[PDB]
Subunit: 424 residues, 3 copies
């Protein structure tokens, strides 16, 4: 029933938190540091703190809890670290800082050891605490199977969820993972902000400034949130149109080149990768628009034609249908739901029901426009009304999709999708 | 640091996509085809394309990327495929097309080889691309442990998420998996459509046609979406009633037979299996009803008694309570949330809070009916009003559930639930 | 192709359901009972029911499907259970009933056997049925690797999802797991109920009783659900304030003590652990408030100043912003979404956007209060209006957070967060 000894190199924040987590989870830790005299009182009395040359002798699994630039300080400990699993927990301060990942550099430093990458994601504060809602998954990568399984078992005993990802070819991925902060959302968010700013300025120029000399009824105790009420929906529908224009453009490139075995242009690849983020931003903005259209027009201050009844009911119904379809798409976007669906079912949901949602949203805007545009006042300052642009982009998307259904084009796109593209 | 060679049989769409994915993920591929002269220019220069008899010699893991009906074309390669892992990636065009699954048929063809089922779910386009939101899980089944783990490691190196499911007894399941398209939703969707059509026709006959001779105030510029506003809620509540009538009927069958060790009738089994789909359809229709009741009655065109204040506030509150409980049930229906809950907690949530939601919905409809039914006009054309049916079904469900609480019945149902049913 | 024999000890409800599940999943079961004459007709004809001393001879994996207090009845079968995997499926009737878990007690009883904990979560009715939406994950813990993997494979063949959690140090956790019923929700729910009751009584005393002698316009055909409309929002905002006051107090304790390596007081630890439950309760109550504010003020019975337009639009917009941020936080609270986010991204979302949501909610309440408080009538009965308390708690939270941004305090808190706390 003797506890298994685990070695740790260095005495820092991560070393102390790791030692706490190991001791609480039924382990015995041997820590090697340059000056055990200095670091001995830091650690509890059940921690055996000695020199570098001593800790390695009495352990098999060693956490290299030092920074990358100090790895060469372990050069003298080359023949002691023979056949001993070295768990590399290091992290970089910048994505792609070095030509090779930290684990591969360590492996090149110590050819005879068994280098296992892992435990870098935890923050030396989740190690001190118990289970945490973000830092409960640890990714482990080693080119040696046995050492990888030993480290996975160690992670299991430390109340973690081990995740196996390969043979140090994945070390770069799990070193870049702790450093990323919504990398795929930056582009969609910038696009949404740009669209919102442009439509805000368009409404300000057309709706307010052009009749401002006529009326001039607003001051700083007024705000253009009638304009944000006209800006959120257009941004949402434009984001949906951008979600599906990427697929249209991919089809166009495939038809033009004649093969699917040609890499898309880098901008098209980035556009295709962030379609989920664009769609979720569109759903969020559509929901905010629904909230505004419910709360504001019906407020207590708002209390201060049969064909019109027709129109109002009909485009409200179309908006509700589109919102329901978008809600289905967003629900399927949860990782568990997406993984629980076949690729055929997921493709049906996303592609088909999103195209249907875009078409229904186009009708929902189109009715409003149909009896808000024929009056020459709203065709103001030579500038089309707000709904005209929010129609012109989904119109392009929908006409493209319909073009893709033509028999000649459908046949030339099936002959590509199904492999016979251009034999050579 | 030499790359591991992986063999592939055949040169088709799947073979080419698989070769691309293998080469990009640090592998070396040897492809065997009938005519290497023909297929050599198809594949890159780092691909060794030779005959069938040559590729097997220089590899250990071989992807049998050919259709099932051509498996007998490998009969001559029986003594070369001795002890070599054969990954069967084949798929059928129809569920339960053949008496035995593809993997088992291959294993019977080659008794001495190690047959591993896997990689059929990916679509030869997710292999070409990177990570995909539906095709990132691969299911692997082999009756040999070592070969199964080798194939799982191979899937890990190919940026997939290996899932182990057994010993080729699960081959049929993961061959039917790529072919299913919402199999459990078909029944609930057909039931919902039937209910919606019946209630639409009922409202058309009662609300419109019966006084149509009296008024005749509608034309084709009118639509019965006052009727869909009366059809969505009834369909939602009826779907909930059908969700819980299945449990009531299962209890009735258990009490009648005296044991739980008797298989339910096939219709009852299918009803019990699709309870989740019926409940989610009910939640979706209830949410659509909430959206209609918010957007339509308050529209700008809609602008064109204390006990009544009482009633309106009270049934709105009951509707909100029921919607909240249904939202809790739907949130627990996510696979991650369901797996994160104990069976006791999940049972409490679903059973208890869904019965409470059904009861509260019954009250919410019942108040509306209580002061919309006593007037003889709404008891029109000898036909009960719309809410009467939406009450009569949940009333049956609730009276059944209350009957199940009787001391004699509760005791006879505990003596069953807890094992003492009928000893023999 | 001979089936693998699996032994089962005892003949009860769990034994029968387990035997059914094993037989259906291609196994052959040998059941040992005290009186095979009695239990033989219970089980099918393909089940070999014999004495205790006979079943062990013809099997290797044995399910000890008897209660803990009867384990000593297997004392005579000590030398027969040598090297045989014993899967302990037992459960306790109370959390922490015994000093050592059931699996560890069994292991102490039989030192020479290989004890594996598992299959306790399933309810002897999910074993009889097929896949179930709560009982499809089984947790397995053994201090022997090989036996643990054998039991995991057995669980895989039984259409389960094996989960490995360690070396019998996790046996207590997975014995307590079937017994817990929302353990972390009890405290937050009691707090929410207490807040709701207190604010209901406060509104009853101030809003109704104090002018009750003045007007007396209500009877039992009236209800205080104008008061629940004033109670739900305050409870939601107070729950959010309590969510973040825990972090403020943790920071205060860290600054006072000078280290993060000191355990928080038990009440603070329990407060910190249940922050997710408090936040989700706050989100649920905020959504119920949104539903009430939409449905009730706009009802058909409700149909029975430019700066005010200003105010109404502005605080509605702030409420919508806060609801959107809370929705983002709740979406990230799904286990799949939380596990799919880096700890940095999850920390950003939760901490930063929740503080922003709290600030925006404070403004949203504050505008309403700003032009509903300056009238001396609402400062009624020497008691502050309802919004004043719902402001005073988030005000304390926000001033604390701002204090944490002071340069001296920020520096003393970074010197703690980053390890240099108090060297010894
Ligand atoms: C609310 C919301 C949530 C969303 N969530 C997600 C999400 O979680 N994940 C996600 O990925 N997206 C998500 N999306 C976006 C969604 O994936 C896209 O809208 C949808 O995939 C577009 O379908 P498509 O037909 O344009 O593209 P696809 O079907 O993906 O194909 C794009 C292009 O590739 C071609 N192509 C397709 N299959 C093949 C093949 N086998 N061989 C050759 N060429 C082929 C098509 O012809 C087309 O030119 C979401 C969108 C919304 C609105
Ligand atoms: C929005 C929504 C979402 C839903 N999501 C899901 C979902 O994700 N998954 C899902 O499965 N369902 C889901 N449902 C449906 C839900 O499961 C059912 O409403 C609920 O289980 C019915 O409870 P019950 O008491 O009728 O049935 P159960 O408790 O399941 O039992 C049915 C019958 O079996 C008997 N029985 C139960 N336990 C035993 C036992 N141990 N031994 C012998 N007999 C027993 C009962 O007496 C009864 O006769 C959802 C419903 C809704 C509205
Ligand atoms: C709708 C909703 C859903 C929610 N869902 C969840 C959920 O799923 N999971 C969950 O956990 N919470 C959840 N929450 C609550 C959420 O986690 C908290 O609101 C948030 O974490 C508080 O941030 P903080 O800065 O106060 O605390 P934290 O950042 O967690 O830190 C608390 C204290 O620890 C200190 N500290 C932090 N990091 C370190 C460190 N490295 N070293 C030393 N000291 C440190 C801080 O200074 C502070 O004193 C939810 C809340 C809401 C409203
Ligand atoms: N939150 C975290 O801290 C965290 C989280 C994840 C991963 N990590 C990784 O874990 C490792 C430990 O980080 P840390 O925060 O603990 O680092 P730190 O506080 O900077 O500690 C540096 C450690 O390196 C040792 N060291 C050895 N040779 C050295 C040299 N020449 N110069 C300087 N130091 C030398 C020191 O040990 P002596 O006492 O013997 O000098 C000391 O224990 C890093 O690789 C980090 O990327 C940290
Ligand atoms: N999207 C997909 O394509 C996909 C996805 C998942 C699974 N799969 C499975 O993967 C396998 C490959 O599918 P595929 O689409 O690549 O098929 P395909 O395009 O029809 O190719 C058929 C292949 O079979 C070989 N073959 C051998 N003997 C043959 C014979 N007698 N008659 C005809 N062909 C013979 C051919 O090789 P030669 O050049 O030597 O003649 C050719 O490479 C199938 O089992 C399929 O079910 C495919
Ligand atoms: N839903 C469930 O039932 C469920 C779920 C999860 C886990 N479990 C666990 O699985 C085990 C089986 O539970 P169960 O519900 O089947 O129990 P049960 O109905 O009470 O059966 C008791 C069993 O213990 C045997 N036994 C041996 N020595 C005994 C003694 N001295 N006194 C009494 N019985 C003795 C009996 O076998 P003989 O015929 O030879 O006397 C009988 O088969 C328990 O440990 C339970 O915690 C049960
Ligand atoms: C319950 C669901 C919805 C309701 C009740 C609703 C309501 C409305 C209303 C009343 C208008 C008239 C303009 C205004 O009031 O400011 C409008 C316009 C608009 N709707 Fe919606 N909507 C819904 C969903 C959606 C969705 C999901 C989309 C797009 C994905 C969308 C796209 C638009 C657009 C772009 C406009 C712009 C028209 C203009 O600014 O002139 N709507 N909506
Ligand atoms: C915020 C939540 C809800 C609100 C505001 C609401 C509102 C209403 C209103 C105003 C009516 C009167 C009939 C009408 O206006 O067309 C009604 C009727 C009805 N409600 Fe709801 N409801 C809600 C939730 C629900 C839910 C969740 C269910 C069932 C699961 C439900 C079941 C019904 C049914 C069946 C009727 C039919 C009455 C009739 O057609 O005569 N309601 N609801
Ligand atoms: C769409 C979102 C929201 C809308 C439309 C809304 C609407 C309102 C309205 C109209 C009032 C005036 C008092 C009343 O009508 O009873 C109010 C008050 C209040 N709001 Fe909201 N709200 C929203 C979201 C929120 C959220 C998310 C919170 C807190 C997390 C919140 C906190 C409060 C509080 C505490 C009051 C109390 C004021 C009082 O009782 O005097 N609101 N809200
Ligand atoms: C993050 C996502 C949303 C980015 C999508 C933004 C779109 C509108 C941007 C991003 C990159 C852009 C492309 C970048 C480069 C070129 C080449 C030149 O001929 C101008 C047009 C063209 C082809 C641009 C078209 C618009 C474009 C595709
Ligand atoms: C929204 C838009 C971008 C959707 C795509 C429309 C355009 C780009 C597509 C639709 C029809 C396509 C054409 C269909 C047929 C041919 C004939 C052959 O020579 C291949 C290219 C060519 C000439 C295609 C070029 C691209 C094309 C013109
Ligand atoms: C997919 C789900 C929702 C199906 C539920 C539909 C219900 C209403 C249908 C489906 C199958 C049907 C049963 C099929 C067969 C019989 C036998 C005969 O005596 C008529 C009634 C009875 C017992 C039917 C009752 C109604 C029933 C249970
Ligand atoms: C909604 C409905 C279907 C719920 C179930 C109600 C009916 C079917 C149930 C409830 C009470 C049950 C009875 C309770 C007691 C007995 C006595 C004994 O001889 C077993 C059968 C019998 C006669 C049961 C038959 C089924 C029964 C009548
Ligand atoms: C389950 C969660 C929400 C519990 C949070 C409830 C809060 C308000 C309660 C729970 C435990 C309580 C603490 C328990 C003990 C003490 C010590 C004494 O000096 C009184 C105050 C103090 C410090 C209490 C302050 C309020 C407190 C922190
Ligand atoms: C909402 C509230 C609880 C937030 C926290 C505010 C209080 C408790 C915090 C904020 C500023 C803190 C002080 C900042 C600086 C010092 C000086 C040094 O001697 C450490 C303790 C001491 C004296 C701290 C004690 C705790 C403190 C006073």
């Amino acid at each position: 029933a003797r506890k298994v000894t685990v070695g740790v190199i260095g005495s820092g924040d991560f070393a102390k938190s790791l030692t706490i987590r190991l001791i609480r989870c039924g382990y015995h830790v041997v820590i090697g540091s340059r000056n055990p005299k200095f670091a001995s009182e830091f650690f509890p009395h059940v921690v055996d703190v000695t020199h570098h040359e001593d800790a390695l002798t009495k352990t098999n699994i060693i956490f290299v809890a030092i920074h990358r630039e100090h790895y060469t300080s372990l050069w003298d400990l080359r023949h002691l670290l023979v056949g001993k699993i070295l768990i590399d927990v290091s992290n970089n301060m910048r994505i792609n800082q070095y030509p090779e990942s930290n684990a591969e550099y360590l492996a090149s430093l110590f050819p005879d050891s068994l280098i296992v990458k892992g435990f870098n994601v935890v923050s030396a504060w989740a190690l001190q605490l118990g289970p945490k809602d973000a830092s409960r998954q640890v990714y482990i990568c080693s080119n040696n199977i046995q050492a990888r399984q030993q480290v996975i078992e160690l992670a299991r005993q430390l109340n973690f969820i081990p995740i196996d990802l390969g043979s140090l070819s994945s070390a770069r991925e799990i070193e870049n993972l702790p450093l990323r902060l919504f990398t795929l959302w930056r582009g969609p968010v910038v696009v949404a902000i740009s669209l919102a700013t442009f439509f805000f300025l368009y409404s300000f120029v057309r709706d307010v400034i052009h009749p401002y000399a006529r009326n001039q009824q607003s001051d700083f105790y007024k705000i253009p949130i009638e304009i944000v009420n006209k800006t959120l929906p257009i941004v949402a529908i434009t984001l949906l149109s951008l979600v599906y224009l990427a697929g249209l453009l991919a089809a166009a490139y495939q038809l033009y080149y004649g093969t699917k075995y040609r890499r898309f242009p880098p901008w098209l690849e980035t556009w295709l990768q962030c379609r989920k983020q664009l769609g979720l931003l569109s759903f969020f903005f559509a929901m905010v628009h629904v909230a505004y259209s419910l709360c504001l027009p019906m407020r207590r201050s708002e209390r201060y034609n049969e064909e019109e009844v027709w129109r109002i009911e009909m485009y409200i119904s179309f908006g509700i249908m589109s919102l329901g379809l978008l809600s289905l798409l967003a629900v399927t976007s949860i990782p568990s739901v997406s993984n629980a669906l076949n690729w055929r079912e997921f493709s049906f949901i996303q592609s088909t029901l999103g195209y249907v949602a875009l078409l229904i949203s186009t009708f929902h805007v189109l009715i409003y426009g149909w009896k808000r545009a024929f009056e020459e006042e709203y065709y103001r300052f030579y500038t089309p009304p707000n709904f005209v642009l929010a129609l012109v982009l989904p119109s392009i998307v929908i006409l493209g999709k319909i073009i893709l259904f033509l028999p000649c084009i459908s046949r030339k796109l099936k002959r590509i999708k199904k492999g016979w593209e251009k034999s050579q």
